[PDB]
Design a protein around this ligand. Structure first.
Ligand SMILES: *[C@@H]1O[C@H](CO)[C@@H](O)[C@H](O)[C@H]1NC(C)=O
Ligand SMILES: *[C@@H]1O[C@H](CO)[C@@H](O)[C@H](O)[C@H]1NC(C)=O
Ligand SMILES: *[C@@H]1O[C@H](CO)[C@@H](O)[C@H](O)[C@H]1NC(C)=O
Ligand SMILES: *[C@@H]1O[C@H](CO)[C@@H](O)[C@H](O)[C@H]1NC(C)=O
Ligand SMILES: *[C@@H]1O[C@H](CO)[C@@H](O)[C@H](O)[C@H]1NC(C)=O
Ligand SMILES: *[C@@H]1O[C@H](CO)[C@@H](O)[C@H](O)[C@H]1NC(C)=O
Lengths: 50, 592, 50, 149, 50
């Protein structure tokens, strides 16, 4: 998948701890299940990530 | 006198578009070369109006050309004609003679305005014989002279100041509105037009009068043309002619007015109409460059409103607290408990005229809606000049030695006079107080003791000799004396907020619970907006409403069904507008 | 930090708008609302600055 | 600020009495009971309420004061109606419409004004201000300085 | 300047807490204390920003 090499594949695992909420839909966390992680709690206060 | 009107005709309400019409000067100030943004009553851009038409000429049917039209929040009465027939606006009147009826009858010898409190008739129409002089001989609008309030005459008004041309000479435009109590009228005259014509114009304000009444609906009027040529009924026996007028209802809107070098309005853009609009407003300019712009947010508004309260109906015992025959001393202040009952504070207002129901931390009027926990009631008798002395954090004898209130006290006091109840023929001395104590007492603490103490060293130990003065002093309370030294009765109602164990509150009727809908809710004084959904979270049997990472509630327990729900904002987001520029196109794409 | 800074009372009666509006008349609720608004505006400005 | 003179009988509500002045009919209109020797709370009292609304419209009362001669081209104080300030009050060429009285600018400060008596438009500029920067060559050498307004 | 701005009224009766928190009634004393502490916090914040 994609055209990443071996070194890049190693690199996108050590530091990619959080890719943040890069525009996640409302239906992803609308109160269903436990959920209510850091991203969804912040979104309800107006803070978003483009 | 007045006569009824007959021969009513029903026609379809023909509609037509008003291309950016009905914009006036909002305020009586001067500006120039500014793109000022206003927020006032305006006729929305590109809206259809009720195009009335005067048809059925000669004397066939003549139509019911002057019906009653609703007057909700404004009117944009326009007119196109040549013979100057349409006049006589009746607006803001109930038509049932409930209150003042407003008339503006003009184009007579001079413009006049008639305002009287008459009792209205059944069918109004203003007669005008086709004689040499057109005078309103018959007053069919009204037939009573109960009262009259205002009269007024104006020289310059509504004249067709022009020449003699066959084309439609004048296009009158009017704006009728009530400025929260008084009626304001705008107007302008438009020259001939070779059916609202396209263009832009502004209206100059005119005379305004207070009046101030209830408003039901608007009624127009037409000048009669009764002639001897046709034998007709007294209700309707006049020739029709030809006329046309428009009606539009004003709504609250936000505009962006542009002023010229003369201080005159030359253009305006109506916000909340098109996607390219409101970003032409965010940029605060009439030209928009290509790119992506963020305009505003979109939210789903709630559609209903629900309330849920505990289903108890027992009345609280506020009688014996206030109707007690004999209160106790100040140092023995008779703590009481009130719980598990419905408390109505309206019945508390019935007391002595000298009343001092002043409260801290809650308004005196909003006691009914809140739901409290463990409301207390504390009754005692205090001297007249010490009613103001009992207060949160106020120093003094009675406060620091007998009754101490906490600094963050919630609740309030009730004080009423006891001129005759607590004063005997020779005076009453049952009530006592502690003049001397070891030190200041803690808030909401009671101590009753009469042991004589070593006031000046050398402890008496019951001797009560010199330098030993008794701690308990009595009250005189003469039957007649100064108001400052006359007994008063005071009660304090202390309750604890934060509403974890809601127990008492008052008379709020529950409503059926609705789920999966963006709705309001009032769960035991916990007003908010969101959607209610069944929750799989496991609450322990003692667990009330939950919380989230922040301090905002996330779950709440049903006070009646005892079930756990979830709350969540129903919708929100951002809106962006993709535009290729203004000089090349006027179409945009919206990105949600 | 910006999310956590929403629960501060800022020297007011409560940290929630609805409770303050329900428990007080506008004549005295104006001061509390103004205090909360100015506190939250000052809280928001520093994040933008950083 | 709404007044009604509806003397019609008011329906009580549930189980209406049809306004026939019979049982279950409530008459809102009642009379006050006043006595020469009665409670102070029920003692009669006369109440008058007066209201006013400051606006941009021409004022109407403007009671006893002193009117002085108008001066131009000098940084002076003015008390036009209720509008106070300081300016030079020069002549203006702004074409006020007949219904306009006050001028205004971006910062909501009245640039122009119409005087109540002479009926003319006057500009307003708060005369002159600003100037700083004394220039010094060092204090061992001399105590002579120059000022740069 | 950070040290010097510690002796200003900041819209109160005096710059000394002893004359504000003491020998006065609770409510307005608390209001004045809140004014002083918010002003000092603002001064600290602007120093940190510089
Ligand atoms: C105005 O909208 C359309 C446009 O012609 C028209 O058919 C309709 O009857 C008018 N009224 C309303 C309420 O839409
Ligand atoms: C503004 O008024 C002047 C006064 O003579 C006039 O010449 C000019 O045409 C007016 N401006 C516009 C845009 O008409
Ligand atoms: C009244 O309240 C009790 C207490 O929980 C509840 O069990 C009962 O269902 C309620 N009655 C109704 C009709 O809601
Ligand atoms: C107390 O007594 C007065 C007069 O007897 C009466 O009007 C009132 O209803 C009683 N109860 C309360 C709570 O005031
Ligand atoms: C519209 O404006 C842009 C920005 O100045 C310009 O580049 C473009 O050529 C204009 N379109 C025309 C002149 O047709
Ligand atoms: C005001 O009074 C005096 C004389 O009547 C004078 O200043 C001036 O002529 C008057 N103004 C007007 C507008 O009549």
């Amino acid at each position: 998948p994609s055209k990443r090499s071996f070194i890049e594949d190693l690199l996108f695992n050590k530091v990619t701890l959080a890719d943040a909420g890069f525009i996640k839909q409302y239906g992803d966390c609308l109160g269903d299940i436990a959920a209510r992680d850091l991203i969804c709690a912040q979104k309800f206060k107006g803070l978003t990530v483009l | 006198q007045c006569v009824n009107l007959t021969t009513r005709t029903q026609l379809p309400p023909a509609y037509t578009n008003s291309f950016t019409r009905g914009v006036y000067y909002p305020d009586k100030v001067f500006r120039s070369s500014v793109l000022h943004s206003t927020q006032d009553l305006f006729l929305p851009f590109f809206s259809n109006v009720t195009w009335f038409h005067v048809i059925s000429g000669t004397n066939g049917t003549k139509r019911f050309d002057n019906p009653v039209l609703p007057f909700n929040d404004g009117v944009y009465f326009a007119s196109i004609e040549k013979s100057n027939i349409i006049r006589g606006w009746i607006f803001g009147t109930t038509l049932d003679s409930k209150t003042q009826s407003l008339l503006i009858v003009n184009n007579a010898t001079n413009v006049v305005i008639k305002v009287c409190e008459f009792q209205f008739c059944n069918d109004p129409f203003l007669d005008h014989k086709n004689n040499k002089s057109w005078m309103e001989s018959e007053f069919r609008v009204y037939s009573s002279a109960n009262n009259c309030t205002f009269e007024y005459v104006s020289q310059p008004f509504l004249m067709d100041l022009e020449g003699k041309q066959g084309n439609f000479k004048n296009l009158r435009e009017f704006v009728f509105k009530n400025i929260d109590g008084y009626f304001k009228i705008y107007s302008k005259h438009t020259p001939i037009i070779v059916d609202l014509p396209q263009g832009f114009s502004a209206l100059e304000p005119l005379v305004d009068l207070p009046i101030g009444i209830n408003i039901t609906r608007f009624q127009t009027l037409l000048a009669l043309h009764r002639s001897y040529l046709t034998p007709g009924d007294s209700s309707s026996g006049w020739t029709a002619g030809a006329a046309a007028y428009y009606v539009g209802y004003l709504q609250p809107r936000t505009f962006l007015l542009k002023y010229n070098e003369n201080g005159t309005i030359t253009d305006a853009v109506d916000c909340a109409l098109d996607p390219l609009s409101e970003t032409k407003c965010t940029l605060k300019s009439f030209t928009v460059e290509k790119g992506i712009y963020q305009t505003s947010n979109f939210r789903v508004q709630p559609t209903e409103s629900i309330v849920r309260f505990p289903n108890i109906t027992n009345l609280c015992p506020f009688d014996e607290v206030f109707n007690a025959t004999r209160f106790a001393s100040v140092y023995a202040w008779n703590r009481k408990r009130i719980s598990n009952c419905v408390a109505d504070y309206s019945v508390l207002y019935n007391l002595a005229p000298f009343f001092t129901f002043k409260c801290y931390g809650v308004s005196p009027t909003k006691l009914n809606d809140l739901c409290f926990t463990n409301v207390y009631a504390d009754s005692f008798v205090i001297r007249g000049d010490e009613v103001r002395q009992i207060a949160p954090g106020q120093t003094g004898n009675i406060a620091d030695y007998n009754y101490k209130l906490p600094d963050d006290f919630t609740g309030c006091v009730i004080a009423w006079n006891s001129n005759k109840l607590d004063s005997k023929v020779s005076g009453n001395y049952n009530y006592l107080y502690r003049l001397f104590r070891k030190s200041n007492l803690k808030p909401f603490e009671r101590d009753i003791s009469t042991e004589i103490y070593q006031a000046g060293n050398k402890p008496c130990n019951g001797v009560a000799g010199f330098n030993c003065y008794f701690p308990l002093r009595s009250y005189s309370f003469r039957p007649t004396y100064g108001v400052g030294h006359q007994p008063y009765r005071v009660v304090v109602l202390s309750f604890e907020l934060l509403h974890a164990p809601a127990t008492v509150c008052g008379p709020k009727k529950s409503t059926n619970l609705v789920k999966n809908k963006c709705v309001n809710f009032n769960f035991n004084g916990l007003k908010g907006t969101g959607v209610l959904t069944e929750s799989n979270k496991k609450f322990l049997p003692f667990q009330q409403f939950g919380r989230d990472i922040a301090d905002t509630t996330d779950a709440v327990r049903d006070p009646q069904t005892l079930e756990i729900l979830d709350i969540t904002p129903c919708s929100f987001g951002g809106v962006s507008v993709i535009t290729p520029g203004t000089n090349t196109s006027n179409q945009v794409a919206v990105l949600y | 930090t910006l999310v956590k800074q929403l629960s501060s009372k800022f020297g007011a009666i409560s940290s929630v708008l609805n409770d303050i509006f329900s428990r007080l008349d506008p004549p005295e609720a104006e001061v509390q609302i103004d205090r909360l608004i100015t506190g939250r505006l000052q809280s928001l400005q520093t994040y933008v600055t950083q």
